[PDB]
């Protein structure tokens, strides 16, 4: 399913490429927005912005501002965030 990952060094320390590499390393890929949304509909809540497919950043809220808070597809892929991975 979908899950949240931080860099070893702590919160908001992964670039887009690093986030993608971390999800791959663990056997998956970055979650898509639709995957993250489906996970949220069945209770997945994390208050931490992360990279996802296509270079979007956001995070899922189940109980408050409900929904995925969208930080958009980021122009600067060297911004440091967490990661949302998909590994079914």
Swiss-Prot record:
Residues of the full protein shown: 36 to 130 of 277
Induction: Up-regulated in peripheral blood mononuclear cells, high endothelial venules, airway epithelium and submucosal gland in response to inflammatory cytokine TNF. Down-regulated upon differentiation of mesenchymal stem cells to osteoblasts.
Protein name: Tumor necrosis factor-inducible gene 6 protein
PTM: N-glycosylated.
Disulfide pattern: 23-85
A GO cellular-component term linked to this record: extracellular region
Result of changing residue 54 to A: Decreases binding to heparin. Has normal binding to bikunin
Role description: Major regulator of extracellular matrix organization during tissue remodeling. Catalyzes the transfer of a heavy chain (HC) from inter-alpha-inhibitor (I-alpha-I) complex to hyaluronan. Cleaves the ester bond between the C-terminus of the HC and GalNAc residue of the chondroitin sulfate chain in I-alpha-I complex followed by transesterification of the HC to hyaluronan. In the process, potentiates the antiprotease function of I-alpha-I complex through release of free bikunin.
GO MF annotation: an example: calcium ion binding
Any one GO BP annotation for this protein: positive regulation of cell migration
Result when mutating residue 59 to F: Abolishes binding to bikunin. Has no effect on transesterification reaction
């Amino acid at each position: 399913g979908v899950y949240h990952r931080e860099a070893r060094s702590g919160k908001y320390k992964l670039t887009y490429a690093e986030a993608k590499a971390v999800c791959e390393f663990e056997g998956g890929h970055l979650a898509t927005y639709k995957q993250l949304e489906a996970a949220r509909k069945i209770g997945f809540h994390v208050c931490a912005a992360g990279w996802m497919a296509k270079g979007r950043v956001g995070y899922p809220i189940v109980k408050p501002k409900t929904g995925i808070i969208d930080y958009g597809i980021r122009l600067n892929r060297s911004e440091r965030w967490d990661a949302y991975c998909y590994n079914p």
